[PDB]
């Protein structure tokens, strides 16, 4: 009321900074850039340096680097040992006390990468919001991108916090991620969890929708504004073949947006459930029926036996801090059944 | 008593919405009942 709706007023330094930041350059710096470009950059560096030189010989008792003769698939950035528990592994913290070499040896580089990457993701979706605002468009892209942030937070931050320490978080690396996947399969029976089922359904349905929409649009083009492809022809075709076909373009593209986001959000909820060891692991009725009747046996019993085998045969080296030694007679075997 | 409310609106949803809702509820049921029974 006192003044006009912020038209000119005074050219404070903030206005000059805003004008410079939002210049139509080759790369849109924007305000979010101040949070995105540095952090994200370091994250990338934190990985590549991590993959190249440092080793995991002390945290996990493994060699994970090109320097030690590891392929691209095998190389990885390993998490800090389980003794470090939930420390953030600041280079200036008590654990490292400003010694960069020992900070690298202890595995704090994983914490560096994870934290800076999380803040980079935050800055990135802020950048999406900023550009959408600058172009006067609805920010549905940010809503879509919220799902991968949810998955990253639920997998890399919530899960280790729910567990003993950072040790059990995924380690950045292809073979490391495969180990993590098999680790969940062995212990948590992650495949059986309903939330993972809903997430995989979402993902496969998203791929299906992508393929079908591309093929349909590319195979109904008009001969040569107006829409290039015949919507009526496509609707008729997919109603004849499948039975149901889209009738509104906006609804179709919104559905394409909606599927993957829901799938990944549900999978993230499931991973949160696992973080507290609330795992859909067992069916009590089937277990008791199998126990009383040795003859009875389903695929579920075989899956449980396979999980027992995975745990028994992998815990020896996947969890060195436990100092587990299994006599050869104790390891499960199929013939011993 | 107050005057009639100006911003009174009614909710609608077409047959597609009903089919979507029923399919969602039944799919969730068939998925989760297996674990509810346990």
């Amino acid at each position: 009321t006192i003044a006009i709706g912020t038209y000119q007023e005074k050219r404070t330094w903030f206005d000059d900074a805003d004008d410079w930041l939002r210049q139509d350059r080759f790369v849109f710096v924007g305000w979010s850039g101040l949070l995105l470009f540095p952090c994200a950059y370091f994250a990338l560096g934190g990985w590549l340096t991590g993959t190249t030189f440092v080793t995991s010989w002390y945290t996990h008792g493994l060699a994970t680097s090109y320097l030690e003769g590891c392929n691209f698939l095998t190389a990885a950035v390993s998490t800090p040992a389980n003794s470090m528990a939930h420390s953030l592994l600041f280079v200036w913290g008590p654990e490292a006390q400003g010694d960069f070499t020992r900070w690298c040896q202890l595995g704090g580089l994983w914490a560096f990468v994870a934290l800076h990457g999380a803040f980079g993701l935050i800055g990135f979706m802020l950048r999406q919001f900023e550009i959408a605002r600058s172009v006067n468009l609805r920010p549905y892209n940010a809503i879509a991108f919220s799902a991968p942030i949810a998955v990253f937070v639920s997998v890399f931050l919530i899960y280790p916090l729910g567990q003993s320490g950072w040790f059990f978080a995924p380690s950045f690396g292809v073979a490391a991620i495969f180990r993590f996947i098999l680790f969940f399969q062995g212990f948590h029976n992650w495949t059986l969890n309903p939330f993972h089922m809903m997430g995989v359904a979402g993902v496969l349905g998203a791929a299906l929708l992508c393929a079908i929409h591309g093929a349909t649009v590319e195979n109904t083009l008009f001969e040569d504004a107006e829409e290039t492809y015949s919507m009526v022809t496509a609707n008729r075709f997919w109603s004849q073949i499948f039975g149901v076909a889209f009738s509104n373009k906006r609804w179709l593209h919104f559905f394409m947006l909606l599927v993957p986001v829901t799938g990944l959000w549900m999978s993230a909820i499931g991973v949160v459930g696992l973080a507290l060891n609330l795992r859909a692991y067992d069916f009590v009725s089937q277990e008791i029926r199998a126990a009383e009747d040795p003859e009875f046996e389903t695929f579920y019993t075989k899956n449980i036996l396979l999980n027992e085998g995975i745990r028994a045969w992998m815990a020896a080296q996947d969890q060195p801090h436990e100092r587990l030694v299994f006599p050869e007679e104790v390891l499960p075997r199929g013939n011993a059944l | 008593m107050a005057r009639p409310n100006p911003n009174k609106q009614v909710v609608e949803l077409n047959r597609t919405s009903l089919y979507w809702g029923l399919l969602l509820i039944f799919v969730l049921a068939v998925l989760f009942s297996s674990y509810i029974f346990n």
Partner: peptide
């Protein structure tokens, strides 16, 4: 008796699919 519940759910879902196919709402 859980089996009957499972079959009821499956048959109901199939009915929803059938009704979605053959009894579509004409546009607008």
């Amino acid at each position: 008796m859980e089996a009957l519940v499972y079959t009821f759910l499956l048959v109901g879902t199939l009915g929803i699919i059938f009704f979605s196919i053959f009894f579509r709402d004409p546009p607008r």
